[PDB]
Amino acid sequence: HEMLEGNERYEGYCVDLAAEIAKHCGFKYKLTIVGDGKYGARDADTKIWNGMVGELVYGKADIAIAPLTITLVREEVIDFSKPFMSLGISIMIKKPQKSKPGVFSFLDPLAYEIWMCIVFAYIGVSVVLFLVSIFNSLWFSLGAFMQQGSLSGRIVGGVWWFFTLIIISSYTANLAAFLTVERMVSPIESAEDLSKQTEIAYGTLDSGSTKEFFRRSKIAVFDKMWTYMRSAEPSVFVRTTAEGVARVRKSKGKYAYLLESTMNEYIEQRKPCDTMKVGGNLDSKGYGIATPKGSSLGTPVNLAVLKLSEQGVLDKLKNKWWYDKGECGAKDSGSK
């Protein structure tokens, strides 16, 4: 970025969109960064707009192309274009089923103490068949061991047959249990089933559009999620978006984060590829290109956005910076 200058300084989705917008209208543009940020909000006391939306109402810019939320408070002050990218609130969890094969699990149901206890009974019966009747008696006692089990030797094989019968049955019985219990798994569950259990915690951002959604939501499923996170201790909220991403990675799959599908799908495609979007979106929303009201650019820009969606351009630009240039390109097609 130091050697270059001008519009080529920056690269991204909206950057490519900035040209495709200018091509179907015909204007020499200039990519300016907002001096403060925060998208577009209005203060409570002073009631002065700030951010990108503010630089349209005050005439400091001529158009705002960015992932700008199409909200009602912003529609009152600027003309939005139709959505170039539909999205919604989603869920993010760790990559499940990370373990575990190997010969150490080959002695799991029968506990570690029983595999070393069954061997005390085998040599204890091969030494009694030594008495009731060194190289051919151990071969005869082993020849009776593989086929289940004098009046003194018959009750040895009779009682040993009961004992070996119990272990193989308690082995087979418990082995089905670990497979029936495995056969439940979520795995991978819906947004409603996330609210039902409290073993894996979940939360959102501390101040943003995501938290306020659960606040005044009158839907039972989402109100139950709200009453949980409000009283949740320790605090399930996070300060910044970077923290919420990091907290899921270091919780051993025991914490989830809720955010917009766009920002969720993008972290799925960046190293170390341990996040994943699960379930469908929660609400309906999308991004839009803002213009000053009454501006001549308005309706032409809105018409152009519809042109790019139906020609297959906005779908292609979405795939480009998400999946193609994504560092986890192999972790998407074969992840299921």
Binding site: I114, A121, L151, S152, N174
Partner: protein
């Protein structure tokens, strides 16, 4: 998620009926050697 696992305290119930049969097996072995 169980993880019910297997209890050694209940496996011993058959380890005691087996050694009990091994102790009975030594009592019947001696009466065969006498008669």
């Amino acid at each position: 998620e169980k993880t019910s696992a297997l209890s050694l305290s209940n496996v011993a119930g058959v380890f005691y009926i087996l050694v009990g049969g091994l102790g009975l097996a030594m009592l019947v072995a001696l009466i065969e050697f006498c008669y």
